[PDB]
């Protein structure tokens, strides 16, 4: 009938209601988001006389002890002097209340998803994309820090926040599913439209992976819809071949699931299984960005910053993000050198 007093509902969560007063401090205004995790509740801190937003967690082992690693990564973040690290939120505190882990962070604006939507999906221009490009570009030079080496492992429009609706300025959100490099435990992971080939494959992966998925943010950001939308891992898989092509031979011979998507012939090479897609590497990304035709849909036509060598720069950036080896694909710091951002 009741759980946790009447405080807990059936999922485990707590019941938010409007203006309740938390341990004489924070003043609870309004429910602003909602997970597996539990929920995240806009409040007002007194004693900072700031708002904040609170993430509370359910009261289950399973997802405190999920949160637990989520505080023990903020924390460790927090620790680093480097100015890199005012990308990534900013945990300020976090409490026990009425049996729920509550991690108060400081209060964001509109995710980029929303910032799409404003846009009915025609995207942004080049020059907000090259400023979250660099902002993101440090942003993942500080979890690549040799101490953190943190995959972030999620990376995707709605986890950009702004921090300020009238700035360019953005931070990245929800660590829940971030770890540590190490040995592999977990496979199935990244939101499958930024999922990279070495994950689809199976194979070992690295930080790299978080490049691979900021380079198909970046390019959505800009045309305004997904790079690679795929309804399953096979439709991924082929909507990536469309424009990159077959992945090397060298790489599909080691991958486990590469049968899944593609077929070793008597000759040795690899081709696709049937299931629709133009042939292998045909939907040229030079195309998909309207390099020579005044960007996407031509809409970009005659702006500022929106020129043909302006398009080739940020091009060549991002194919260097989407190189299908992990080992050659480009590093943080060699991004923030490129000449996109001069
Ligand atoms: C939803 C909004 O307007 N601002 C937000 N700001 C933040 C900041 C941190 C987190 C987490 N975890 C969630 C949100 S939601």
Redesign the pocket.
Known sequence: KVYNDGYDDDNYDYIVKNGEKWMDRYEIDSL??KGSFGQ?V?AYDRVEQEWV?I?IIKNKKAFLNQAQIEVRLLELMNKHDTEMKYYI?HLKRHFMFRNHLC?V???????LYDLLRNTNFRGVSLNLTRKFAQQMCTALLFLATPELSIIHCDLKPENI?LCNPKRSAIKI??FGSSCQLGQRIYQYIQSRFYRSPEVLLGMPYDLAIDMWSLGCILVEMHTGEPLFSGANEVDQMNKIVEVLGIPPAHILDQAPKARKFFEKLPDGTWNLKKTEYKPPGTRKLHNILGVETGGPGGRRAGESGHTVADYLKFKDLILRMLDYDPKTRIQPYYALQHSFFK
């Open positions: 602003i988001g995240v806009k937003a993430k939120v991690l962070f400081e209060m964001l604006s509109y995710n926040l959100v929800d």
